[PDB]
Design a protein around this ligand. Structure first.
Ligand SMILES: NC(=O)c1ccc[n+]([C@@H]2O[C@H](COP(=O)([O-])OP(=O)(O)OC[C@H]3O[C@@H](n4cnc5c(N)ncnc54)[C@H](OP(=O)(O)O)[C@@H]3O)[C@@H](O)[C@H]2O)c1
Ligand SMILES: Nc1nc(=O)c2nc(CNc3ccc(C(=O)N[C@@H](CCC(=O)O)C(=O)O)cc3)cnc2[nH]1
Ligand SMILES: [Mn+2]
Ligand SMILES: [Mn+2]
Ligand SMILES: [Mn+2]
Length: 159
């Protein structure tokens, strides 16, 4: 099973200048809980944005060019990325925009954080078709002293 996990600001913005400009510790904690002990697939730009391997997860990087770091696994196509995960129950695709576009048709589950923040960005989450997806979990949180925007955790499963 393939799942996508992402945090979206208003208008599906996910990034600006290879960064995420907000800071929501509660959402990063949600990301860690839902990805720990699973393989994570990311594109090369997102690998450079994170800047280090994510501990406790098999890190798989998509790039058309040879890898430059043997602490992670480098693959050259979507099919190779999936195969490199082996026989696991759940593969987590962690972006970015181009990678989400390619894996969306193959995904059965979406873990989405909707952030009440207006961000100028240059990268968006794919338009998906709402009729294809059922919301099975949602949890709203107001802003607090640690998290400066309100946010909604949602899990959707392909109907
Ligand atoms: N809010 C969120 O949840 C979230 C999550 C992740 C990322 N982001 C943000 O998203 C932005 C990065 O997204 P992006 O769309 O620019 O880049 P990306 O999807 O992270 O990376 C694209 C790169 O991945 C490689 N790639 C993708 N598909 C491939 C394929 N089928 N075969 C081989 N290589 C492939 C290519 O690398 P080569 O050029 O080396 O061939 C391509 O240039 C940043 O702003 C980051 O902060 C946000
Ligand atoms: N919901 C969601 N939020 C995100 O921030 C996110 N980020 C990415 C890609 N970028 C990043 C950037 C930093 C870290 C990171 O530092 N993660 C630590 C945080 C642990 C914690 O804060 O409790 C980790 O171990 O996962 C992960 C992904 C992909 N999907 C996401 N999905
Ligand atoms: Mn092929
Ligand atoms: Mn197999
Ligand atoms: Mn806000």
């Amino acid at each position: 099973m393939i799942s996508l996990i992402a945090a979206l600001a208003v208008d599906r913005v996910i990034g600006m200048e290879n960064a995420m400009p907000w800071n929501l510790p509660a959402d990063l904690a949600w990301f860690k809980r839902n990805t720990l002990n699973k393989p994570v697939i990311m594109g090369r730009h997102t690998w450079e944005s994170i800047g280090r391997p994510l501990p406790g997860r098999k890190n798989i990087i998509l790039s058309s060019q040879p890898g430059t770091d043997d602490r992670v696994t480098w693959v050259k196509s979507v099919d190779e990325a999936i195969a490199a995960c082996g026989d696991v129950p759940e593969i987590m695709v962690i972006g970015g925009g181009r990678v989400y576009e390619q894996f969306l048709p193959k995904a059965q589950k979406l873990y989405l954080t909707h952030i009440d923040a207006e961000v100028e960005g240059d990268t968006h989450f794919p338009d998906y078709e709402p009729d294809d997806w059922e919301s099975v979990f949602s949890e709203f949180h107001d802003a607090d002293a640690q998290n400066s925007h309100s946010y909604c955790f949602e899990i959707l499963e392909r109907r």
